[PDB]
Design a protein around this ligand. Structure first.
Ligand SMILES: Cc1cc(/C=C/C#N)cc(C)c1Nc1nc(Nc2ccc(C#N)cc2)nc(OCCCN2CCOCC2)n1
Lengths: 540, 400
């Protein structure tokens, strides 16, 4: 007998202050019991488990579903410690490299052949209820990694990696993976030299006592030359439940990584502050067209390629509209590695530049995760536009190496506040006050040319009138205009430079600013008796 | 030669912090480095029985093309008992202060076996392929708050001759950094440091005297516009939140009526007196400004553009312990974030020299933007805390 190398056990402990499990043994039918006895007999024959005595006060329930043995460690896992992640997060196909051949091997012969730490086997004690409860049920414990235990997958894949590690660094012309009962190896070598190295692998696993396309993997389809997603099934129904929306949304986002032009806003707008599983929710005309467009997008299949490190990596972003963006990543024209989208963050005000920046930062993060590098960017924004923006932007902001692509709609700046007060431009001192309890108030302005206006307002607030007065100052003024205000709120909004807003009031201000040529916007502290800035006209 | 007993704080488990993604070159540099560090017994591969993790990346320092291994021990540090040097208040008063990397010396001291599980970190793989190479520290880990406190004993024994040889040179230790101050001349200073480098082998140059606490100033013009005075009053009103008897009524009186912004308003004698009285007040320091080492130091940075940046350090609003201004050009004219990062380093370094601890920053930058790039320009061995401010502060134009 060729000596099998003993796999060093990983020491396992329970959580501090917690005793082992001690649950009641579930009453079984004589049929189920007769089945488990044979299984646990041949399992004990295979060296998996072993018989124990009354010295083990720990009990773990056991079921039988039809044939197949089921052990419920639901309480031991609540008492077992934590392990390292290993490896919460699957590889993305777009990062893998094209391989000329991929071989499949069985690891169901090897799973159960991974020993368990000795001083922990006493927590895996389970009882097999004898017939009619007329005997102390057969007591047994595990000697290997149980299926369903908290720490089994972590120790399994850990010990597995430790084994393959030498036969991998010595064969750079080979690639391995673990999913899930099987093991997958690939190489670009000759079909002869490949089949050879597979035998070198089987003999390497044989040492530790292991003699054992297209592929469906984690929702993907993996072909030797390309990849895609397993066909997305969108449930068609006149009645749309809340749970069916999240199913629809989730499957759409999944598809958006390779299917370009996927939109998901109108369906996500209908999940705001609602926690239910049953409600036939209607849809707008913007949502019906959206879903009809997605069905038109998913009508023809598209494939992503693999990554070749020898070539540049490029990301291209286009503005879809309504706070939605889409990106495609590639190395050669029209041959995407992957695609994706970005939805604007839930805010009140925003602009295109800030959104484009966010998308880039997302892509950048996503890129480094997959290929371990930052891609070159093709952006729908003129260099000048970016040049003006970041130099003047009150915040710190940055975009990696990039070049402009002339694919409309182009991201631009719609207005720019002056740095210095404008000479020859009329000066509009504005204020806006509102009575807190009666919800009544006024808003208006006075100018250096005698021009005045106060407009009476019902159902409004201070923050709303101070905006309003600026809207009036913008409205009734020349292409150039200075505006003094005392509203740290109103200034704070415009010094954030939005091109779209929730508040229609702000949007109208924005529209006004756009039509202007030069706008200077000064600020003063209120109630300090600053002349021009009149509170006595609006407070009334 | 013997591990000092180290434990965590009451009711706190070890650090379980997610490793963020690293680029290909940084992964290689960490692989190369750790491969050797393993051989030297500094680190040892761990199994899956170790759940904890502390983030780890790699940087490049000045005049060095070799990568350094940076471990963000921020979460592990705040989960250590500490409490094992009263800050040398003479360091901020020396003509020249030199910063040395005494991190290599920590690796000659073994770590308490029971604690090594908390110094777990992970070299990540590209595209989640192979599981991340894991390590734990056997020696004293660089960046750990407990590293200098433990080595504080050994370090005092090392620098015993040099200090008593010249008790005019001040020496301080914070994290992996050793700070050396001297009122000597630079040419003799560098050699005195060169002497201290060979003295350490057998076992960046600041100028704190070229810095004070920046005052608040008002313009001196001969003719004032409405807009000039409106700004002036705005600043004075804000300055009133700090200084006591700041009056603005006589200057506001000039603004009465509704003149054009660019129209020149002549100063009155009543107002000229008021402005003059306001200056005198601003000349005096801030009243009752002390430093309580129990509280947090807060840093606020304002982007002024054209490479200029302003900052303030304080603990209570309108009670600055220090205010400064930067404008350096370290080949970063095209990059705002690199400038911000170099500025954060600078401020933190200065903060270490004065108080012996880093401050908590409030950065004028989107979280998402900062978090993606800051490691790409970081060259310090320590790492402060930071928030993100999203509302454009009006105070920007009051500090310029
Ligand atoms: C073999 C394998 C099978 C499956 C599932 C099958 C089922 N069922 C899943 C994975 C994840 C892998 N693993 C793998 N596969 C490839 N290529 C590849 C080509 C064609 C096909 C097909 N058809 C499938 C895969 N490439 C790599 O990595 C190469 C880059 C390595 N470096 C290391 C250093 O850092 C940089 C990256 N790993």
């Amino acid at each position: 007998m060729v000596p099998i190398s003993p796999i060093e056990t990983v020491p396992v402990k329970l959580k501090p202050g917690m005793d082992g499990p001690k649950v009641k043994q579930w009453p079984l039918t004589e049929e189920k019991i007769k089945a488990l006895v044979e299984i646990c007999t041949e399992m004990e024959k295979e060296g998996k488990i072993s018989k124990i005595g009354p010295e083990n006060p720990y009990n773990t329930p056991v079921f039988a579903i039809k044939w197949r043995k089921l052990v419920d460690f639901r309480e031991l896992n609540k008492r077992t410690q934590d392990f390292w992640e290993v490896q919460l997060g699957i590889p993305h196909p777009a990062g893998l490299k094209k391989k000329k051949s991929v071989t499949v091997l069985d690891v169901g012969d090897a799973y159960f052949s991974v020993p368990l730490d000795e001083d922990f086997r006493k927590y895996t004690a389970f009882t097999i209820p004898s017939i009619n409860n007329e005997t102390p049920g057969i007591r047994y414990q595990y000697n290997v990694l149980p299926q369903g235990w908290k720490g089994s997958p972590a120790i399994f894949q850990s010990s597995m990696t430790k084994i393959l590690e030498p036969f991998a660094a010595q064969n750079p012309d080979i690639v391995i993976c673990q999913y899930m009962d099987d093991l997958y190896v690939g190489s670009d070598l000759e079909i002869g030299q490949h089949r050879t190295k597979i035998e070198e692998l089987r003999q390497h696993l044989l040492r530790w006592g292991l003699t054992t396309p297209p592929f469906l993997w984690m929702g993907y389809e993996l072909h030797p030359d390309k990849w895609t997603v397993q066909p997305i099934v969108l449930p068609e129904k006149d009645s749309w439940t809340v749970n069916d929306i999240q199913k629809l949304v989730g499957k759409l986002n999944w598809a958006s990584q390779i299917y370009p032009g996927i939109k998901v806003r109108q369906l996500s707008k209908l999940l705001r502050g609602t926690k239910a599983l049953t409600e036939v929710i209607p849809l707008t005309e913007e949502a019906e067209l959206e879903l009809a467009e997605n069905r038109e997008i998913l009508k023809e299949p598209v494939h992503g390629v693999y990554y070749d490190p020898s070539k540049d990596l490029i990301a291209e972003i286009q503005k879809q509209g309504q706070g939605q963006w889409t990106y495609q990543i590639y190395q050669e024209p029209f041959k995407n590695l992957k695609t994706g989208k970005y939805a604007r963050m839930r805010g009140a005000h925003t602009n295109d530049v800030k959104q484009l920046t966010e998308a880039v930062q997302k892509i950048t993060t996503e890129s480094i995760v997959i290929w371990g590098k930052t891609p070159k960017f093709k952006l729908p924004i003129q260099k000048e536009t970016w040049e003006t923006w970041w130099t003047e932007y009150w915040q710190a902001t940055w975009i990696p190496e990039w070049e402009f692509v002339n694919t409309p709609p182009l991201v631009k700046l719609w207005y720019q506040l002056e740095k210095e007060p404008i000479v020859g431009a009329e000066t509009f001192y504005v204020d806006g006050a509102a009575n807190r309890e009666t919800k009544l108030g006024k808003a208006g302005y006075v100018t250096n040319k005698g021009r005045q206006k106060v407009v009476p307002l019902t159902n409004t607030t201070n923050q709303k009138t101070e905006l309003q007065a600026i809207y009036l100052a913008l409205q009734d003024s020349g292409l150039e205009v200075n505006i003094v205000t005392d509203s740290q709120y109103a200034l704070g909004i415009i010094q954030a430079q939005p091109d779209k807003s929730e508040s229609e009031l702000v949007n109208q201000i924005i529209e006004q600013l756009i039509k202007k040529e030069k706008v200077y916007l000064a600020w003063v502290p209120a109630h300090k008796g600053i002349g021009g800035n009149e509170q006595v006209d609006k407070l009334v | 030669i013997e591990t000092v007993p180290v434990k965590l704080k009451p009711g706190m488990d070890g650090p379980k912090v997610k490793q963020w993604p690293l680029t290909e070159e940084k992964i290689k540099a960490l692989v190369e480095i750790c491969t050797e560090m393993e051989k030297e017994g500094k680190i040892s591969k761990i199994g899956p029985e170790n759940p904890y993790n502390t983030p780890v990346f790699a940087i490049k320092k000045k005049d060095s093309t070799k990568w350094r291994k940076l471990v963000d021990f921020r979460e592990l540090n705040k989960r250590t008992q500490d409490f094992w040097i009263p800050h040398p208040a003479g360091l901020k008063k020396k003509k020249s202060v030199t910063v040395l990397d005494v991190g290599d010396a920590y690796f000659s001291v073994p770590l308490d076996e029971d604690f090594r599980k908390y110094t777990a970190f992970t070299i990540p793989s590209i595209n989640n392929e192979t599981p991340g190479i894991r390590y734990q520290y056997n020696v004293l880990p660089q960046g750990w708050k407990g590293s200098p406190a433990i080595f504080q004993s050994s370090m005092t024994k090392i620098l015993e001759p040099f200090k008593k040889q010249n008790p005019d040179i001040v020496i301080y230790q914070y994290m992996d950094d050793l700070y050396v101050g001297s009122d000597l001349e630079i040419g003799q200073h560098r050699t005195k440091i060169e002497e201290l480098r060979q003295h350490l082998l057998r076992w960046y140059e600041l100028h704190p005297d070229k810095w004070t606490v920046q005052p608040i100033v008002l313009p001196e013009k001969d003719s004032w516009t409405v807009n000039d005075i409106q700004k002036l009053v705005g600043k004075l009103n804000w300055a009133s939140q700090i200084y006591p008897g700041i009056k603005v009524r006589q200057l506001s009186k000039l603004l009465r009526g509704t003149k054009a912004l660019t129209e020149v308003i002549p100063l009155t004698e009543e107002a000229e007196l008021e402005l003059a009285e306001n200056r005198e007040i601003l000349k005096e320091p801030v009243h009752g400004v002390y430093y309580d080492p129990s509280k947090d130091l807060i840093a606020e940075i304002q982007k002024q553009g054209q490479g200029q940046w302003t900052y303030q350090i304080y603990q209570e609003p309108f009670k600055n312990l220090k205010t400064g201004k930067y404008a350096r050009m370290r080949g970063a004219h095209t990059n705002d974030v690199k400038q911000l990062t170099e500025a954060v380093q600078k401020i933190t370094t200065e903060s270490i020299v004065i108080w012996g601890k880093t401050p908590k920053f409030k950065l004028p930058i989107q979280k998402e933007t900062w978090e993606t790039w800051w490691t790409e320009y970081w060259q310090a061995t320590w790492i402060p805390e930071w928030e993100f401010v999203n509302t454009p502060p009006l105070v920007k134009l009051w500090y310029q």
